[PDB]
Amino acid sequence: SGFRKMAFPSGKVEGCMVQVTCGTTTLNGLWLDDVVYCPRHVICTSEDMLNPNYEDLLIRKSNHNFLVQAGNVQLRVIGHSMQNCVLKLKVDTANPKTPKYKFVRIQPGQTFSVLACYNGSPSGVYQCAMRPNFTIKGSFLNGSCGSVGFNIDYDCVSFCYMHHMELPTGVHAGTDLEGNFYGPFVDRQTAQAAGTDTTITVNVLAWLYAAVINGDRWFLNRFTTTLNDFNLVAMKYNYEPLTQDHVDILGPLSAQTGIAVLDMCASLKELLQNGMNGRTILGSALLEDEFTPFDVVRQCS
Amino acid sequence: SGFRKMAFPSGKVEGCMVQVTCGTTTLNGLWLDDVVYCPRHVICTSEDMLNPNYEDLLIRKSNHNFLVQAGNVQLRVIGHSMQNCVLKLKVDTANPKTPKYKFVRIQPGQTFSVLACYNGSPSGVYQCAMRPNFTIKGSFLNGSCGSVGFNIDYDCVSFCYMHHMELPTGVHAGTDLEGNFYGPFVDRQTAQAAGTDTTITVNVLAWLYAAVINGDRWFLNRFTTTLNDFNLVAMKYNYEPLTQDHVDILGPLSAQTGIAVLDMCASLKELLQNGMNGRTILGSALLEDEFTPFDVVRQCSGVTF
Numbered sequence: 001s002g003f004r005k006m007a008f009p010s011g012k013v014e015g016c017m018v019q020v021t022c023g024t025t026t027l028n029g030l031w032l033d034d035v036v037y038c039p040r041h042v043i044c045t046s047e048d049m050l051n052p053n054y055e056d057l058l059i060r061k062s063n064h065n066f067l068v069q070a071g072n073v074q075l076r077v078i079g080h081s082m083q084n085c086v087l088k089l090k091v092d093t094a095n096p097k098t099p100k101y102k103f104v105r106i107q108p109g110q111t112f113s114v115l116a117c118y119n120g121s122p123s124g125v126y127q128c129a130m131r132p133n134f135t136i137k138g139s140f141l142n143g144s145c146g147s148v149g150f151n152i153d154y155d156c157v158s159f160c161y162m163h164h165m166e167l168p169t170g171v172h173a174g175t176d177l178e179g180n181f182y183g184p185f186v187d188r189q190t191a192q193a194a195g196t197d198t199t200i201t202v203n204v205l206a207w208l209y210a211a212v213i214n215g216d217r218w219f220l221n222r223f224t225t226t227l228n229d230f231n232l233v234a235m236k237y238n239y240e241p242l243t244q245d246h247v248d249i250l251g252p253l254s255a256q257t258g259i260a261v262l263d264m265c266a267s268l269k270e271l272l273q274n275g276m277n278g279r280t281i282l283g284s285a286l287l288e289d290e291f292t293p294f295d296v297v298r299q300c301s
Numbered sequence: 302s303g304f305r306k307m308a309f310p311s312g313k314v315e316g317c318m319v320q321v322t323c324g325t326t327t328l329n330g331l332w333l334d335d336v337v338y339c340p341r342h343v344i345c346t347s348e349d350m351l352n353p354n355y356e357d358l359l360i361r362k363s364n365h366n367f368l369v370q371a372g373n374v375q376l377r378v379i380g381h382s383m384q385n386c387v388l389k390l391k392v393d394t395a396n397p398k399t400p401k402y403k404f405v406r407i408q409p410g411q412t413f414s415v416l417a418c419y420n421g422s423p424s425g426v427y428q429c430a431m432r433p434n435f436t437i438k439g440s441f442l443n444g445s446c447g448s449v450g451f452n453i454d455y456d457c458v459s460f461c462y463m464h465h466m467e468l469p470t471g472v473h474a475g476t477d478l479e480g481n482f483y484g485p486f487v488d489r490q491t492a493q494a495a496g497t498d499t500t501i502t503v504n505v506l507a508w509l510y511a512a513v514i515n516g517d518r519w520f521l522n523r524f525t526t527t528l529n530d531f532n533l534v535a536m537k538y539n540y541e542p543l544t545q546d547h548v549d550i551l552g553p554l555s556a557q558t559g560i561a562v563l564d565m566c567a568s569l570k571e572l573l574q575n576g577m578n579g580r581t582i583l584g585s586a587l588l589e590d591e592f593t594p595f596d597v598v599r600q601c602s603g604v605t606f
């Protein structure tokens with residue numbers, strides 16, 4: 001019993017964290033096989049960041065301009081190339097601690113663990129969700145750039161995020177491991193703002209099912225709703241629309257607890273209407289949206 | 302910016318997790334040097350748990366009755382002894398991945414990371430606090446016994462907890478790595494209940510400082526309180542007393558934000574007698590007490606391991 005926000009064991013990722021230096025800029029890199037991946041803005045000065053021409057800045061660099069440090073061992077850079085917003089530094093040594101891995105691009109609502117690093121040294125691990133506005137509500141200071149988000153579903157590390165920047169509201173923006181940003185963001189100091197952040201409805205429903213599995217039933221009601229009526233209400237609370245795909249995703253949890261998805265949708269409608277009235281659901285006074293249907297089945301069952 | 306419940310990197314501990322089997326019972330073990338540590342109830346059947354005589358159960362077991370498995374390699378048990386509620390299995394191979402470590406017993410209110418394992422395989426890491434009633438609000442299923450709690454001090458892993466059991470309310474009980482339980486619990490299938498819990502006051506204050514560092518300042522007020530007046534109010538709301546030691550420990554955060562500890566206590570006093578009034582602090586509608594003053598400083602300054 002118990003329901004906690006849990007991150008994946010970070011060991012497989014810690015063995016990949018290296019320090020990358022280019023001139024005066026120092027950030028984190030992901031050393032997999034003989035390649036170190038890091039944000040391409042490592043080649044920029046603060047006076048280049050407004051309108052950087054990365055192709056132009058990179059062509060002026062040689063391998064000896066990149067200092068890669070794995071622990072106390074300096075790695076020799078034998079090549080450098082750019083793929084979208086990620087710099088790929090070819091090194092002379094394959095990482096012996098390279099886990100079984102793949103690069104995955106995730107969708108909003110998906111969750112992942114973040115190993116926050118500074119100077120190639122892991123400092124902490126936390127669990128995150130990709131917000132519907134493509135930002136992550138992380139905990140990142142200056143120097144955390146290059147820290148990665150991942151999932152470890154059996155033996156294989158799926159790298160899904162690389163941290164690049166913090167937006168003026170304190171939220172974070174980054175790319176998949178192929179350097180493509182999540183969201184309408186660019187790696188430049190130009191005025192950028194996240195879209196209105198909404199609640200991940202499917203995740204709140206999943207967490208309400210996790211509450212029923214752990215014994216909590218106070219919020220249940222004898223109502224059902226249509227998918228359309230639910231969405232009209234949920235949208236008024238800044239909740240993401242629930243699609244038929246989301247309803248199908250909640251099927252296993254619906255079958256396990258004996259509560260139809262649209263019946264649980266009516267409980268959610270009521271919770272948004274009344275608040276919790278001094279009660280908690282799984283030790284929380286707010287509706288949690290950073291547990292996917294998959295995380296609920298993995299943690300509870 | 303950002304404030305998350307963050308656990309220490311679990312890598313140094315993952316390299317120590319092994320599977321321990323005794324008959325039909327299978328749980329997790331901590332392999333450090335040539336010793337595997339695990340709950341002593343691994344020797345018990347479901348009937349033995351009713352009233353176990355662990356010396357009697359242990360004297361009947363030989364080394365080959367314990368199957369230790371490190372990944373896909375079976376470790377040969379060359380000795381077995383018991384220290385309090387922990388079984389120590391001597392093995393023929395020293396763990397090459399043994400980190401720099403020490404065994405520490407923590408005090409209630411102190412926090413640590415838990416590497417939840419099943420069949421010697423780590424499945425997740427989470428942060429938690431030793432509640433003042435000596436339970437941990439963990440996330441543990443059957444087969445999680447032997448999962449450990451730890452902190453990291455630079456390169457040293459301080460093992461502070463080993464999971465043993467779940468109480469009827471869903472909360473968890475375990476021991477330090479010397480087998481001494483945290484709290485008035487025993488390793489036996491019998492009626493046991495946690496005492497009424499309290500809020501870790503110094504940790505709530507630390508989290509209020511973390512909110513201030515992050516730009517959440519609505520709860521700040523012009524007022525201050527005496528340490529004695531604050532405690533009279535805290536006692537009323539099942540909040541742990543704030544000692545002068547706690548006030549000193551919050552000093553660096555008090556200096557960084559420019560808010561005196563007793564100035565922040567008047568905010569906390571108001572939060573108890575008035576609530577949050579529909580507002581949140583760091584995205585939370587409740588006062589968080591599972592971040593110590595050290596966790597706040599560590600997270601907000603970027604300390605690495």
Ligand SMILES: *CCC(=O)N(C(=O)[C@@H]1CCOc2ccc(Cl)cc21)c1cncc2ccccc12
Nearest residue numbers: 140141142143144145164165166187188189302
């Ligand atoms: C690695 C630090 C860093 O670069 N951060 C930034 O957000 C940069 C600051 C200037 O603006 C900027 C524009 C584009 C890009 Cl891609 C990067 C930056 C950074 C990242 N995470 C958290 C941070 C907290 C505080 C300062 C800087 C942060």
Ligand SMILES: *CCC(=O)N(C(=O)[C@@H]1CCOc2ccc(Cl)cc21)c1cncc2ccccc12
Nearest residue numbers: 001441442443444445446465466467488489490
């Ligand atoms: C590792 C499984 C286990 O033994 N757990 C227990 O709590 C035991 C169940 C029977 O009663 C009992 C009495 C005393 C002791 Cl020391 C242990 C037990 C176990 C541990 N954590 C979470 C669990 C969840 C569900 C079932 C069993 C759990």
Ligand SMILES: [Ca+2]
Nearest residue numbers: 316318371372
């Ligand atoms: Ca191992």
Ligand SMILES: [Cl-]
Nearest residue numbers: 084085179180
């Ligand atoms: Cl681009």
Ligand SMILES: [Cl-]
Nearest residue numbers: 235236237238
């Ligand atoms: Cl609206």
Ligand SMILES: [Cl-]
Nearest residue numbers: 285286586587
């Ligand atoms: Cl909450």
Ligand SMILES: [Cl-]
Nearest residue numbers: 199286287288
């Ligand atoms: Cl919410």
Ligand SMILES: [Cl-]
Nearest residue numbers: 433434497499
């Ligand atoms: Cl108490």
